[PDB]
Design a binder for these strands. Structure first.
Lengths: 177, 114, 65, 83
RNA sequence: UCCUCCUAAAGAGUAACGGAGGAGCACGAAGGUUGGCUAAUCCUGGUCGGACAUCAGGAGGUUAGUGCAAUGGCAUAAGCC
RNA sequence: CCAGGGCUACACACGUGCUACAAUGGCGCAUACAAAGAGAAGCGACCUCGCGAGAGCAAGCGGACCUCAUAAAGUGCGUCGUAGUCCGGAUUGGAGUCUGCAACUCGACUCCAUGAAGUCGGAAUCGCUAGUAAUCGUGGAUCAGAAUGCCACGGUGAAUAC
């Protein structure tokens, strides 16, 4: 909605003026945004993962997919095909509105916020931040709360470098201490 | 129902809910309610949002939750890397104000294992 | 999207207490009244204010003449 | 904490030693037995050999040490550990 | 008694109280068809989460996997849904 | 003879206390009733100044005269609704005040902030027969400063002795 049209004017025009792009297709596009909740303590009871799924469904607009374990590990008492994590991959306009609520509303509420350090890019412009407790989104009632139950949001941009993706996310006024 | 860092409880009175902030105790909340004008025996369920945003700026008057934990942590850090007496007692894990270390100080040196 | 399994996701009007109004498609079920905004936050404005980190010769002189 | 209308404390012999070590320009470690004296902003950078009852331990004055007293950087009890 | 490899001398077969391992089953789906998909292991980034759970990307290309020993096979997959 | 340190250390163990774990209580307001003492390099009114510890100004008193010196539990009205909580108040960061040549080792107090263990206590064990136990406050000696100890004084005030 808002951040899409603000992108389509200002971000493409500024990454045009300060990065040498003969074509507009070279400008990095934030493509998808996934919220992952690596619950993990549902080796004992899966009531907890069942609550965490509805917590993610309240945060985003999509019903989250439950992720079963890939290989069996006896270090953490997990079994093959045990549902141990939860995820949402949200792309398109719903991702744009989640990006609205993340920047304009959510990141002021991280409760002694000092600015997300920009060195969390992995090598090709994809960002990853970790939200430590779930109540930073105002969709949670906070009269109901049970556990802290954080998550991590990773943003996939089509940038190839860290500086191009950093300038892309900084063009949408990321905090960036 | 939410001030600078955290949520305050809503069915409690004004000064009691205001002490749930780090950095605000009893006299701080008395002065905050005296500067705000709200009588302290109201609840946050009773109180609307304009009073609590005039409360928000008046508690922004004080060094509170996040930067206060920052200030206390940095003050202990400055004493600890300074290497003085109180810093060295902070380093070993002993009392720093001249308490008896012979028998007591299980609050400081921790619960009695061995 | 898969039709009925998703939660409702409606246009609401959030009421930013800094003075602002924002139409937002969300899930809260009412008109949410948030406290601070992306505008007028101390980190966003520049009022983050990390303290001096060493004012000992300042402190000695504001104490003593 | 001393009362503010008394002023901070420094010994006559230590203060005149500090002034003659500044006027003389020389910056070797000098010794005192006066642990009770407050450090001062003219004494930065020079070494003070402070008595701990047995020895004279060299103290290097920093920016962070200014308002304190001289005894805080010479621990008079040696403890390593029982077991 | 049966199966796999070597002995076994590039067809088959080929002994020893020669060298090594398994079987005496399972499964109404782990069979049939249609449609779709593609590993291991490392590196980086990220709430608890840490060598190793979940996420995202990169490298690598079948070193993976096959209900069960070994061999031969398998990408058009015989592997996964 | 002197300066500085130590007698205050700390993996631990024991003895004697104080504060508690709350609602027969906590907090806020107003308010009633004591006895016994100490005081001149001392006790230090009233007023002014600071949130306070305190300072300034400084009368009175070698005292049934003046000062320390408002007694506190109690009572009256509110609020808290049983939570580690408006219980608890250890710890620690900051800013102070006073004594003293000097408060770092190593004082007392005040303010602001913090808000630890603790939810009535194992085996065991102690004191008490009536103005006693229990509980609440006050005072003195030592003393420049430094009592939760010691010695004294009163307030409320039981149960149980086959």
């Amino acid at each position: 909605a808002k951040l899409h049209d603000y992108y389509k004017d200002e971000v493409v025009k500024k990454l045009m003026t300060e990065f040498n792009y003969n074509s507009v297709m070279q400008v990095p596009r934030v493509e998808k945004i996934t919220l992952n909740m690596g619950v993990g303590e549902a080796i004992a009871d899966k009531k907890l993962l069942d609550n965490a799924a509805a917590d993610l469904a309240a945060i985003s607009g999509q019903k989250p997919l439950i992720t079963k374990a890939r290989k069996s590990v006896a270090g953490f008492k997990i079994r093959q095909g045990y549902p141990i994590g939860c995820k949402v991959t949200l792309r398109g306009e719903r991702m744009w509105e989640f990006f609205e609520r993340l920047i304009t509303i959510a990141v002021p509420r991280i409760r002694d916020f000092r600015g997300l350090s920009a060195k969390s890019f992995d090598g090709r412009g994809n960002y990853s931040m970790g939200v430590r407790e779930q109540i930073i989104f105002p969709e949670i009632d906070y009269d109901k709360v049970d556990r802290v139950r954080g998550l991590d949001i990773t943003i996939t941009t089509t940038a190839k470098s860290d500086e191009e993706g950093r300038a892309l996310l900084a063009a949408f006024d990321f905090p960036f201490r | 129902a939410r001030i600078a860092g955290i949520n305050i409880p809503d069915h409690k009175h004004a000064v009691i809910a205001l002490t749930s902030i780090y950095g605000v105790g009893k006299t701080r909340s008395k002065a905050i309610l005296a500067a705000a004008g709200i009588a302290e025996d109201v609840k946050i369920s009773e109180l609307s949002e304009g009073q609590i945003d005039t409360l928000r700026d008046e508690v922004a008057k004080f060094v509170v939750e996040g930067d206060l934990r920052r200030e206390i942590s940095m003050s202990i850090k400055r004493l600890m890397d300074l290497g003085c007496y109180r810093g060295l007692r902070h380093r070993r894990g002993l009392p720093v104000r001249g308490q008896r270390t012979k028998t007591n100080a299980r609050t400081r040196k921790g619960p009695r294992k061995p | 999207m898969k039709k009925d399994i998703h939660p409702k996701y409606e246009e609401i009007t959030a009421s930013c207490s800094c003075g602002n109004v924002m139409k937002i498609r969300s899930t809260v079920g009412h008109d949410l009244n948030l406290d601070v905004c992306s505008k007028c936050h101390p980190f966003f404005t520049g009022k983050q204010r990390d303290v001096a980190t060493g004012g000992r010769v300042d402190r000695f002189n504001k104490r003593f003449n | 904490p001393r009362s503010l209308k008394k002023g901070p404390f420094i010994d006559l012999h230590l203060l005149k030693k500090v002034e003659k070590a500044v006027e003389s320009g020389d910056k070797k470690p000098l010794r005192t037995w006066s642990r009770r004296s407050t450090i001062f902003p003219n004494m930065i950078g020079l070494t003070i050999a402070v008595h701990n009852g047995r020895q004279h331990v060299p103290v290097f004055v920093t920016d962070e040490m200014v308002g304190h007293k001289l005894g805080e950087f010479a621990p008079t009890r040696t403890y390593r550990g029982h077991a």
